[PDB]
Design a protein around this ligand. Structure first.
Ligand SMILES: Nc1ncnc2c1ncn2[C@@H]1O[C@H](COP(=O)(O)O)[C@@H](O)[C@H]1O
Length: 292
């Protein structure tokens, strides 16, 4: 299979519910690429939007490059830089066990990516291990963020005027990691991304969250089943037997006002101090770099 003249579609490397991702070859440049395909069917496809957001993000550390956008037949096409495995894939590879050092190494970078997205007037609204990828080669130590499928402006580009507080929202992201605010149908802001990262971190520590694996025919039902267990579990019980810093983090994030600018530095500082007190070095050796 080919896409136009310049690209070679290889084998599928990811299924997204938005589109599917193929490993590919830029034949004209002699470089491996990732190629996202979306089928056009209505007059509101969303890959055109996602690519316009990627482009506004460019020149960010841990933002993949976009090489080409256009259409062939009834498919929208996005060609981007190829990245390594997801943190979900790496977790599975490491037997669903990460060391505290690996979790803290990741935490520092994952706050910084989210910060950078917020600095560009957007919230992500789909923060999950699947959506963080390690780079390849010289970028093997660099955590990337992908999938701006569900991203939106939280403040005016011009004025920095925050979006107003609104309720009864469409529950559209992944329920395992959704903020308590998202569960009550409250409009998402910067605090919701950072809380979601909190649940991602405790996911890596535990191996699973105590609200996982609950069957539902519907997306609405998935959120509601998880909501009950989540809202009945104190931050302090969730994180018990782990460094206080994981509690302090989730607590800080839940205490933020709708339209508060987070202290991204403080949250980074928390994990750094724990990191140094444990006696770890920032050598960028994750558990999987030790595989012989
Ligand atoms: N540029 C990329 N390079 C490598 N894998 C990717 C890339 N983009 C997406 N993927 C994979 O595709 C999966 C789903 O992509 P998405 O539906 O866009 O979030 C992710 O979990 C990744 O494993």
């Amino acid at each position: 299979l080919r896409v136009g003249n310049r690209y070679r579609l290889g084998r599928k490397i990811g299924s997204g519910s938005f589109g599917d991702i193929y490993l590919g070859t830029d034949i004209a440049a002699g470089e491996e690429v990732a190629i996202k395909l979306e089928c056009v069917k209505t007059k509101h496809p969303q890959l055109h939007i996602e690519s316009k957001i990627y482009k506004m993000m460019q020149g960010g550390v841990g933002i993949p490059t976009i090489r080409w956008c256009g259409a062939e037949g009834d498919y929208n096409v996005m060609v981007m830089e190829l990245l390594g495995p997801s943190l979900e894939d790496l977790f599975n590879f490491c037997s669903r066990k990460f060391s505290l050092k690996t979790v803290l190494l990741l935490a520092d970078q994952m706050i910084s990516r989210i910060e950078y997205i917020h600095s560009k007037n957007f919230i992500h609204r789909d923060v999950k291990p699947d959506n963080f990828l390690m780079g390849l080669g010289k970028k093997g130590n660099l955590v990337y963020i992908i999938d701006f499928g569900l991203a939106k402006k939280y403040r005016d580009a011009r004025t920095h005027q925050h979006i107003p507080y609104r309720e009864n929202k469409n529950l559209t992201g992944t329920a395992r990691y959704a903020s308590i605010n998202t569960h009550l149908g409250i409009e998402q802001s910067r605090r919701d991304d950072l809380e979601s990262l909190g649940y991602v971190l405790m996911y890596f520590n535990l191996g699973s969250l105590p609200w996982q694996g609950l069957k539902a025919a519907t997306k609405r039902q998935k959120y509601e089943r998880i909501s009950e267990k989540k809202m009945s579990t104190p931050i302090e019980v969730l994180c018990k037997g782990y460094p206080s810093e994981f509690a302090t983090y989730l607590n800080f994030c839940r205490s933020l006002r709708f339209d508060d600018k987070p202290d991204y530095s403080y949250l980074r500082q928390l994990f750094r101090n724990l990191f140094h007190r444990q006696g770890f070095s920032y050598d960028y050796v994750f558990d999987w770099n030790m595989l012989k």
